[model samples]
Target chain A: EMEEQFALLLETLKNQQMNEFRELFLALHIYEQGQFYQSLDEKDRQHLYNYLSPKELADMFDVIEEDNENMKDYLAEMRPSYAADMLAEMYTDNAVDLLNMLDKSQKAKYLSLLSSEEAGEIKELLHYEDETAGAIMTTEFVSIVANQTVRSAMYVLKNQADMAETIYYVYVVDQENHLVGVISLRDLIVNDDDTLIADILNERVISVHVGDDQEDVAQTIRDYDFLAVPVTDYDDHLLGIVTVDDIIDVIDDEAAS
Target chain B: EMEEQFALLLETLKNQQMNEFRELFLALHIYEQGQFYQSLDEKDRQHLYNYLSPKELADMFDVIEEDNENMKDYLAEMRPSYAADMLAEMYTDNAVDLLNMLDKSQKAKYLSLLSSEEAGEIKELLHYEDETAGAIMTTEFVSIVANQTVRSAMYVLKNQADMAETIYYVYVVDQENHLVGVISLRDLIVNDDDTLIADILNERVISVHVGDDQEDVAQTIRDYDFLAVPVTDYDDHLLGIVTVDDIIDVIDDEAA
Candidate 1:
């Protein structure tokens, strides 16, 4: 019932302010969101993309699970630089999946357009075997030296919170960058400012190594009720943290397959 | 490797220090904790259960996936009143699943032992068809009148945080308890104390009906990135909330 009504409304949005259109678009259920996008003709869809920021565009792509062929077509049609930057805005694992859908030349063009730093990170993530902890983990995570106080840790979080997937628990590392302890945002907020991180940190740090299977990682996080599980190397150096959002995605994907 | 070592260490702690034994027990990984619990013979298992607080015992039961038959046997061995009280401490949905494992007479005995309120909640939950939203959702949720201020809402949360499964999103309801809006805890913490909840609440409240299937509910939550989805009656009276943890369980169970 709402589908034709939404399509009629979406037509008038052509001349409307982009934010107004985007707001209406976001308010739909995700399935309806995909339907609405698919309803638009090629030119109108391109117009929609013009108004969307990279992150917004990435979010749009994130919700479209049923129309993989059309999604790949859209990716191929975009300028390589724009496509690369948009992929950078997406989760690394998701970006890898999108890239895998394209032919060799298209993939190479987009890869060339990506910023070196992002390109390097994506390349490293792509190297890990599928369905392993290394494959699913995001390299962006906040880490601090073991000697810092709660006050300093808060300062670091204030400036760098967006760099990490979750600021709920910040991992503490030693001088050699080996994982040592973890402190939750709750602990920092509840404790006195002068308390040292080492004094209050939970040293019984539970973690998964790079080669561990993804299902095991999900199980560990669920069993402990953790928001994220830090991924480590053989020497216990922290590599990344797989946030619960990604684990949920993995669980859903595996279930669907 | 750690199992035999833990068992040996556990044997040495007979009444020497409850704190020491509890600490060591808690320090083990949850899987190892289950293993250790299973390896304990009946008398020792009972001894361990005697010392465990109801919440800790519930946690122990929550993580054990492979050994339902043994778990049911152990539950049958407990006094009916004690078992009823322990079930009362568990999440209602979880309690329903555990109660289903009991034989007819044992189930009746435990039902008799439960407080009327607790028994009523479980019976109501048990009646929902499996894999429905009503089946997986918890009856515990914090709801408030739309007229309340953030200050009053905060007060309500402070009092009810332990009672609800999630305090992430506080559902706003009308006088008839129809869900009208939602406000997140972040909104409360960051806003001025005197701000009215109705003014700041997101009026486009998304929710699922109680009769919706569990997979659809899980998909809606995953799609929208919701921490919990409120379950409502057909006319939109708020009933309960299905939390992310339960959805994860549903997903894992289906995958298995």
Candidate 2:
């Protein structure tokens, strides 16, 4: 019942409305999404690309990360801006992952087209040793000064929430940007309105240095059941937070290899 | 200089103070933690076990999950309550993973000693098909009725915060306990205190059925970049939630 229904629906959409077709295509499971994409003829795949977003194209690229020859061909055919836009939409760490798979000249071209901000983060991330905390950490996180009141902190969170990879735990820093403590979104919501963040924050934050191996970071998060762990320099200056999702990626990657 | 300092510190602690020895032992990187644990003589390991908390013991067990014969002997030596306490401290899914490694008789003895609450969750999880959403889902989650206001929801969260596996996302259910929508901690923090949860909640939640394959659940989370996904039955009744941490575990396990 299910297979036939989907086949007929897919065939109908393939021949008729492109809008519904794209929506249906995006709605499939990620592996299934790739399978359907690969099954279509080259002309059809190119036609379908017109309706896909940069983010969606990045998702397709992710499915082909291991298929090196196909990935090279895929990049060769894409417009530089489209490729850059897709890389921009990807998580910075993931964008780095895909970029590493590209041939040198192709990678340089794509890197040139990315916004300086995106390219800078990617370039720094690319230099980190594989399987280390720096390699896997996202440059996006919400950090606040320790003296901020609940009301003011919420304002910061509101303004910064869109850019942060995980807003669950916000890092608290000193004037020098040393990570002094950590607070959760739960703490903010459940506290009284006038309280200062420093009063309630857990000052004994466990953080990983940027150079620490990824396994140690993963184990620390697992042991403490933390949503994220802050990355710090030797001076304890905050760098970025490694969210649980990225740790998950590291675990999957390590296990696969 | 760093290596010499740590080497001297490790040698002095190893010979002089058992208390500092175990403390420094637990403080090492996980691989070093496992290595130190394994390097200790059996008598010393038993002494070290006395200082370890149930949660710490669970972490050690996780590191050695692949070492089967040793794990069986390790579990066999512990007191029943001690074993039960370690199991209780574990996430329900992880507890199930270790329990599945035990023989029938050994498994039953340990299960019998576990608190009804812990065993019940473990037993429920154990029956789910491997690699299914149910298998990876944690029974500990925050669920509230949509009729509650943000204040009431916060109150519930405050009480349950310690016990929940992830408080970042809260599931909003209908009267019959059907998952109707979802709300983030971010949503609650930014919203006015008196607003109805239903008013602030996102009605379209992406969830997986209990029997859905784990890959589908992981993919759904990856596609939407969700912190967690609610697990439901055929009737849309919420059972539990699969957090991103567990999804990461599933991905690692599947890859391995």
Candidate 3:
């Protein structure tokens, strides 16, 4: 079996009922094949390859358009990671191209409106090689000083509801601005509140070096099923964290065309 | 309310019910900020970054020792595509590193085990810039001479069942072996078998030009929702076909 194969497509055209019938005829032919028109008859193929009428664009757009337009707009404006989800639904080029094409003025205003941290995160992403870990990081995370007891650390994490994409390991660093130990959220919750953070936290943590390839970052996180892997400078200064959600996007995107 | 989140780290140390333990913590953390740790102490932010073990690479290898053993033995004989998929799951550099590390003779033997058409497909994929259509197409599809009758065409398609991804359309070609038209299987099925292939077919079939960017290819695929798109040379000669499965794979990889 071939599915309720053409039912959906046929239904989409029912209301139009042959109004631009030949164009519809062409679109249906295309919908059957699922691509633009260059793979067919020589002359007709040539004509289609060299040209695209607005009607053809409309038909093609129909095939891949998103259902959650309002959410998509909001996400693009507020959260690139979420917006990345919407872009993922589209053709990669079309998505990136559309994002790139966003009215530059509009994009500037949008960037200005973002919380400074998010703006920095987006700027960081723009600097990364497209397929790398840097491109996939979500800047939001929960951090705590090492000396605090479990009782105090819990308070900081519980207060924030809208934390960024991935927040698994609570990062522990020293005064000189260096990463030192990692502890899972579960570990913090399980230990006695009286226990010092330094006492229970697992100082043995794995992370991606800042310049490491992003694909490597995705692999590292997935292999460990980690909540987050902090990216660090050569001296191990914490820069940002790549979350599971980001890794999932990276995995999905890399596998696609 | 915040949901309970379990740390995988606890799996090795405790036999406690994961869900139950996680929930208990979730309830406690619902309102606690900075209760777990204080910011002013010697245990500062910078020291936290140093916690990442530089030797994690060694630890990871030890954990997967069993998998490594199995891969060494079975990978030498596996089909290249299967091998490729499995390798892709590992770190990418590791994947490429291991693929390159295979004994040349063993690599060739494994690659040769794959179908010739598949080899061509892989070879084609290796040539493109990543994230493009050429990187993702398969070379399998049915092509036909324009003059074949519907009955003859159907017979030809039926024979290709083992190879075709979908028989949504029959590609039509001219004397130069250039693609000339496209025919839908539905129209072909609904029409009388006695009708000439050319008579029942839609002459204006859509396809992907060989050199078009992969993103553009994805757009065409999204726009048309075709089961597969034909790829052709500049002169409109039919090359290999890129199937919908590949398109979906591409879309999913990029989207999520």
Candidate 4:
């Protein structure tokens, strides 16, 4: 059982064996690392924090259960700058939740610590009314402009893959960034580089409105069996996307969690 | 609303107006054209077959509901060679169902008229246990070799696209044609032509065994939300793919 390994892991950390402790801790499954984190007392957790990199720390928390009432205290333990930079490494939607767990100005201060471009996207997300698609949507989606060849689109997707929440489909836009078409990664794989994006683009894009309820947005994805659905404003400008895993976390139903 | 226009179409047909009847019939939604095919009496229907090409005629029946008990009788009307060639043009699964509706050696005679490769495939399908994935899977699926470049894979898919029921994913195989990695069309679009298929291939494929129950296969597709699931024999050789639409028609459930 994990508790048995957890006992040994706790002992290694107490022994101040930095090299051995991290190897064992880093080797655990991501969620297992979270379980170990939850078991730690403040002193042990602070030591764990010191040992793990911020990106590693963020990954541990990212898979942590959402109803972690104790996580607030963990964030409080870190230096303000350290916590802020750690949040920066996480997904926007994920970073949003950690900030939401804070007292008003505390999260704002952390928000201020982000780069201007990154911080701006989060403010717009925070401004949306709760339970709406816009509120749940993450701004870090991949998009491609129309009129490019398949080779160009490939490079564009490669550029955005790291920041993107879902790369299953890339929304195609016009010069003004109005959503015009969609091209699935499946569709891309079937066509050649010489093929024009316009030749194979699915012009009839199925999108959810920005103001739609998250449940309805979730239903559309399930009904269409999509990896994610693009969210748009009234004028059909692409905003963000609600990914499948995000929907699973949003709806109160447990998927045998 | 279709009935009113259907009445107009019948008038155009009954008047012995060949040019107008063919034009109007060719223009309908495939299923709507099927409704027109069902309404015509034998003499009028014979004229429908005469005026329209076999490909057009097959398209009409392709959208016709499965419970058309009289469909077997309609196939009996066409010359055996004509019916067989048209069946060859239709999807193998669709061709299978229509052939299933026939009587004692009647479909057999029509089946024999097809190419040796096609006739051989249909025989194996007819031999499968009813309600199994083997019974439902279509032989016409696109496949790619793992060693190919994206450019080569693209050409391979284009070659197979017309015969395939779903071009959503191309199964990747090896020298002996054993199942290997799978690549979705979405994955293809994001990579360069020079990229090797193995680099982007998804080695872990979700498949339904050939002997699995059709309902269980449908449930697997539904649970995972796949457009289709590949069917493999016990030794893991690729058999065929059972598409979502084929599963939908296989089970008694209405999606509504």
Candidate 5:
């Protein structure tokens, strides 16, 4: 029955096929749509695959190169983060090509330029499927312990003041390093300096499992418009933070017609 | 064999069904990958329906409406052309909702706002499939007879300067209203007043057939970076124009 459904799906694509552009957009649309259809029966699932192909996807690399050239000139000159985010969505080979297309010396300069941690995170993300959690998260945020008083947390914020992206959620952790609660950034700012962190923390947290797909992370972020979402291991150790802008890219990648 | 292929694809989806978001993206990736596997037999064509559900696409109508408020503002205040483009990609129901959400008075104000002839073309294009030339082409441009001296064409451009959209290609039409050639507006400005339009008009023109898909039209625009691509009927009678701004939106809409 699954095979039958797949055959039907492929049949739709074969009928719809006219050129590479259609293939690319339709493939993208289907992938984005399929995420929502995860509840479908096996028969339906197989039918959907019948509609897609790997070579068709690989063929899209060249078009992305051409498109990203215009995009690179537009974004790299203005917002490197947004530009870098867009560049990450393409195939690895094409991403390399785009990096090469940038002023090579500038590329090398930037390559040398990133903070060591940023460089490591980006390289780690590059190693995973682009739609995975590792590839689509930010390494920026503020974390404070449960025992610290409001004054001490305030001290932490003042110390980290110049950072590009910061947020209010002070993650609560136990001695074993398991995440136990999360407190609002406002709690630290609004509370009297003498209040202990344990008194102000909010324990009910909707955190993501580490193996969760990037698309899921993206959807959850958009659904709640949260400033940041935390990825955690089974043992509840915080892995990293994903930001709103990263999800915006995921939506762009999936929704791009 | 077709059934066998479909089965394997379904199995992948079935195994992953317990996870909501994973199932969604995986189904999408599988469908995307399946498209590349060329069918050795014709029966493969009939199986396309099995993979996709009308329900999946139906949900997008709601998704499109969820966050279009800012987009509507962008279309109304800054650029209707941009709005027109993003709206162009939505399903008809969503497009209608978008039109409703937009400032209605502005819609009425611009509905018949351009040249009457061009207005009629827009009304006709309102019905075509979104991806076709019919949907993306503009209904206005500067047209002049070849024999018209450069001085008169300059006057024409100045007269129509208030029009929302028009440009350099002063299409040269003969007595019968058939396109004979095309001239750039820059040439009109730089040339002596006495120069005849025919003398300056370029005979070799790259025009689009009226029924061409928007994607191909976009490709042509990207290839040449043309300010405007002329749309013509089967007999090569000029129909309307598709502009570069519209092309950029077309590219962006795919991203949407």
Candidate 6:
């Protein structure tokens, strides 16, 4: 009924049981595997790099850590060719974050390895500020219109799930990228297929501006008590979401006062 | 860093500390909350309902149970109106499974409470086979065409994330719904945005026919060592996926 599968990974490794351990790792649903990956201390993490393909290692990169303090090292830990391969496998939202934190020399070197398309995207993203509310935001979010039906939105939600910060909450946008309303996956499934998003969306969306501080952003998120917070530019165009996994990380770090 | 946040749910309940326990419960991301929900023994399972909203309770339903063994009882445990509200909240793929396991008496009563739209969807879903490979499939896999770019597919992948069984692996199809190829999310992100699925997809897709036996389907899935397997009809139209969360469920059951 319950999976203790993740708990076993640490013990499985500590016991030095490689027989089928990595095999079992591949069989795991990536979500659970990602869960176990997070718990790895520095040594186990380095050890993990071997059993997993660069692409396999990259899929787990969606979950970010403190200032990406660890990811920066994880990338550096790889040989140049391997890191480049792993870097190519990440969604640019994360790739952008990793590169943004790099020293100029490393940045220039890594940028050289990426395709011109990816490098171009990173260069544009680098124009943004840090320590502000936008610090660790993911630009990949699923935005739909009020004109779409619940069924249409559901269709859109599935197609976008691989990239979005969270499909659990779908943001509504207008013709000009205005922050309008939001729908929870809880709200989306309850309605009939033909029901329009306009009928169900809660227009009282709580959000943060890109100019606000990161601590202020985390407080607003913790106060509202949801997993992701919408971020808009000063002009109120929906920009992205600073998904709360990192906010929770910030809160927990902040918790030790 | 590691979190033992889920492990605390059972202990907090056992300790009888309700002060901020429910508050902490609300704070958990639903995935972790759902993770806690699954480990719930029958006693704690019932104890949990009071601390959670029906929407909160229903949100956990996406990760279904064995024969919906717990879900069926959980619905009956609720007052009719509350159960109706919860039944209203679940995706029909899960709703259909819960309704399918019920006695005709229970089915009729629950169906009466559901909106005509939801009830109708379940009625249609019930027309399908159970023990066959089609058992417990979600008709919600995301499909794309070889003609689309990686960027286009990524756009589609986000739009459909809530509905698809697994966005980690997206299936590619033809004009007639023929299952032509498949692409891993790994393959999707490594390439340039303009790269077409035509440029990267693996043409050799391993699949199971709807008419195949469930155990046979499980074997094929375990052999391939991935999380989801595509299901197609006799004429080769893509139908859905039997996600490996359950295949692992079946494998564990079969393992013993």
Candidate 5 lDDT over residue span A1-257, tens digit each:
33454444445544654354244345332332332234335554334334434333323332443334453343344334434444444433344444556676645654554556435544544444546675555444566678889888766655553332334456777777688878755344446779998887876555777678977886666544355677677899776677644454455567662
lDDT of 2 by residue, B10-78 (tens): 564446676776656555544445656665556666765677787887766644543356667777877
lDDT digits (tens) for residues B42-78 of candidate 3: 3321232132221222122222323233445445444
Instruction: List lDDT for all candidates, in order.
Output: 0.76, 0.75, 0.52, 0.76, 0.54, 0.70
Provide the lowest-lDDT 10-residue window in model 3 chain B.
B30-39
lDDT of 1 by residue, B35-54 (tens): 77877777777777666776
Q: Rank the candidates by DockQ, best first.
A: 1, 2, 4, 3, 5, 6
Candidate 2 local Cα displacement, residue A191, angstroms: 2.1
Worst 10 residues of 2 chain A by lDDT: A60-69
TM-score of 1: 0.84
* Candidate 4, residue B242: lDDT: 89
Cα TM-score per model? 0.84, 0.68, 0.36, 0.58, 0.33, 0.45
Candidate 6 lDDT, tens digit per residue, B1-256?
1146656667778876665668777665454566677777777776787666666676666555537466667677767767776666665557677777777887788789877865664565576787566665667688999998998997888777655555767899999889998987656755778888898888657788877877888766644445578888878888778765555445435443
Q: What is the DockQ for all candidates, taken in turn? A: 0.31, 0.21, 0.04, 0.11, 0.03, 0.02
True contacts kept of each: 0.23, 0.23, 0.07, 0.09, 0.05, 0.00
Name model 6 segments beyond 4 Å from true. A1-257, B1-23, B26-55, B64-73, B79-81, B88-93, B116-121
DockQ of 6: 0.02
Tell the DockQ for candidate 1.
Answer: 0.31
The most accurate candidate by DockQ is: 1
Enumerate the chain B TM-scores of all models.
Answer: 0.87, 0.82, 0.56, 0.89, 0.55, 0.76
Best by TM-score: 1
Instruction: List model 2's recovered fraction of native interface contacts, to 2 decimals.
Output: 0.23
Model 6 chain A, poorest ten-residue lDDT window? A248-257
Mind giving the per-residue lDDT tens digits that candidate 5 earns over B1-256? 4365455654544454334423432333222323322221333322322343433322233234324454344344433443344344343333444455556675554453445643454456666666777676765577778887998887776665444245456787777767778876645645777988888787756788878988889776654436578888888887778775455445556664
